[PDB]
Design an enzyme around this catalytic site. Structure first.
Site, PDB file in Angstrom:
ATOM      1  N   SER A 281       2.392  17.657  18.930  1.00  0.00           N
ATOM      2  CA  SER A 281       2.304  15.985  17.763  1.00  0.00           C
ATOM      3  C   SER A 281       0.930  16.369  17.480  1.00  0.00           C
ATOM      4  CB  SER A 281       3.280  15.599  18.380  1.00  0.00           C
ATOM      5  OG  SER A 281       4.183  15.824  19.221  1.00  0.00           O
TER       6      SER A 281
ATOM      7  N   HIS B  26       6.185  12.440  18.087  1.00  0.00           N
ATOM      8  CA  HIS B  26       6.428  12.810  16.833  1.00  0.00           C
ATOM      9  C   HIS B  26       4.677  12.537  15.996  1.00  0.00           C
ATOM     10  CE1 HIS B  26       8.793  14.383  13.444  1.00  0.00           C
ATOM     11  NE2 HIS B  26       7.939  13.350  12.573  1.00  0.00           N
ATOM     12  N   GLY B  27       4.181  13.590  15.643  1.00  0.00           N
ATOM     13  CA  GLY B  27       3.188  13.500  14.945  1.00  0.00           C
ATOM     14  C   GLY B  27       3.898  13.557  13.848  1.00  0.00           C
ATOM     15  N   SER B  28       2.383  13.060  12.317  1.00  0.00           N
ATOM     16  CA  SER B  28       3.075  13.602  11.433  1.00  0.00           C
ATOM     17  C   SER B  28       2.416  13.021   9.715  1.00  0.00           C
ATOM     18  CB  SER B  28       4.627  12.689  11.228  1.00  0.00           C
ATOM     19  OG  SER B  28       4.815  12.760   9.183  1.00  0.00           O
TER      20      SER B  28
ATOM     21  N   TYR C 227       0.679  18.165  13.343  1.00  0.00           N
ATOM     22  CA  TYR C 227       0.877  18.050  12.517  1.00  0.00           C
ATOM     23  C   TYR C 227       0.423  16.789  12.141  1.00  0.00           C
ATOM     24  CZ  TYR C 227       4.727  21.521  14.332  1.00  0.00           C
ATOM     25  OH  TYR C 227       5.214  22.716  14.882  1.00  0.00           O
TER      26      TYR C 227
ATOM     27  N   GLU D 179      10.394  21.449  23.027  1.00  0.00           N
ATOM     28  CA  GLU D 179      10.549  20.439  21.505  1.00  0.00           C
ATOM     29  C   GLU D 179      11.913  19.996  21.898  1.00  0.00           C
ATOM     30  OE1 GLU D 179      10.717  22.569  17.939  1.00  0.00           O
ATOM     31  OE2 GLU D 179       8.689  23.344  18.551  1.00  0.00           O
TER      32      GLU D 179
END
Ligand SMILES: Oc1nc(-c2ccc(C(F)(F)F)cc2)nc2c1CSCC2
Length: 351
Positions: free
Chosen positions: A242, A200-202, A245, A326
């Site tokens: 990911s 999970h990239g953010s 992001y 995903e």
């Protein structure tokens, strides 16, 4: 009192709580910081803006008049004032325009959470120690030469594809994280089959809130049409998917990425977008089928959880709008965050 936290932990607190990065994001979003400064942001402001985007989406799909759509668009820009300079505010008359504003409100929410956290609370102890405590997360440094570090570096190295190879990823620090109360919350779902260690990239401006309140779902006010597979938590089995992001650049090439244990159970396998409100009976997650999948023979099992660190191979699929897989869960309790990585992006062209 001078902090006793390791420098990589201290430097992570400084990163995720940086007010200049927060303001930089708002300016990038073209928000008027004179009318809407950092401290003026509210949860009720963002929720109300989400509600207007759902009203827009409904108006467009229910054949409302251009005057009705413009009035709605004007309400949005009154609530979240923007600064376009000579330019006029983009009309929120199509689904793309609302997906852009929903994405923005998603990111603004975590900026509100970071800054409210930072400005709130109480002296005589280091402000880095104070801010580490506010995160209500045990952040430990994983040793470069550990077995787990070797597994995580292999996961990053092998799951980095050529399509996204406009940069090389360099793992600087690996943190073993555990958010207060998340293990107990996940326990009912620790039971479920098909648990995988996914990415999970953010944005870095989102991690203070991510560590504090965990990975959340867009609220009920948010338009379900503003998200590809509906309002859920999105993950990837390939680091490069990911890593896109992480919102890094030439100026700031350092990003943050997560490894979460996701209890997927029966997957609702789809090839094209579906605006999921309620999941089908018997299904616990969505698997967006991609053209490329990590080699299933190369799968490893770190702490009873499947690590799909297989090198990028083609899947059967054939008629899909996705290059890479995903995974999506619609219960915030189906996720148990395990590791936080600090990545360096070595940007370079490749053909
Ligand atoms: O790793 C990922 N992260 C995010 C992600 C990034 C930012 C945000 C937020 F809107 F800023 F809260 C939400 C989700 N989305 C996806 C993936 C990999 S699967 C494709 C979708």
């Amino acid at each position: 009192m001078k902090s006793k936290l390791p420098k990589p932990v201290q430097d992570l607190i400084k990163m995720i709580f940086d007010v200049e990065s927060m303001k930089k994001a708002m300016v990038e979003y073209e928000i008027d910081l004179q009318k809407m400064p950092l401290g003026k942001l509210s949860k009720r402001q963002i929720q109300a803006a989400y509600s207007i985007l759902s009203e827009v989406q409904q108006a467009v799909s229910q054949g409302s008049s251009d005057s009705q759509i413009l009035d709605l668009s004007n309400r949005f820009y009154t609530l979240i004032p923007h600064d376009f300079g000579m330019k006029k505010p983009p009309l929120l008359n199509n689904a793309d325009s609302v997906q852009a504003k929903a994405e923005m409100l998603d990111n603004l929410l975590d900026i509100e959470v970071a800054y409210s956290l930072l400005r709130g609370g109480s002296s005589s102890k280091d402000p880095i120690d104070v801010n580490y405590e506010k995160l209500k997360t045990d952040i430990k440094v994983v040793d470069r030469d550990s077995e787990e570090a070797e597994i995580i570096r292999k996961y990053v190295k092998n799951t980095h594809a050529t399509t996204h190879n406009a940069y090389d990823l360099e793992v600087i620090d690996i943190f073993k994280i555990e958010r207060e109360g998340e293990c107990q919350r996940y326990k009912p779902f620790k039971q479920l089959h098909n648990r995988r260690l996914l990415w999970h990239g953010s944005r870095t401006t989102n991690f203070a809130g991510i560590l504090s309140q965990g990975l959340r779902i867009a609220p009920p006010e948010a338009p379900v049409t503003g998200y590809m597979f509906g309002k859920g938590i999105y993950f990837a089995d390939m680091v490069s998917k990911s890593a896109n992001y992480c919102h890094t650049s030439q100026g700031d090439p350092i990003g943050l990425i997560l490894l979460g244990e996701v209890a997927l159970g029966n997957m609702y396998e789809l090839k094209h977008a579906s605006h999921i409100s309620k999941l089908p009976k018997g299904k616990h997650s969505v698997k967006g089928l991609g053209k490329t999948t990590p080699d299933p023979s190369a799968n490893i099992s770190l702490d009873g959880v499947d690590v799909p660190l297989g090198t990028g191979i083609s899947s059967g699929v054939n008629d899909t709008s996705l290059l890479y897989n995903e995974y999506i869960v619609y219960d915030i309790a189906q996720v148990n965050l395990k590791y936080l990585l600090k990545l360096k992006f070595n940007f370079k062209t490749a053909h």
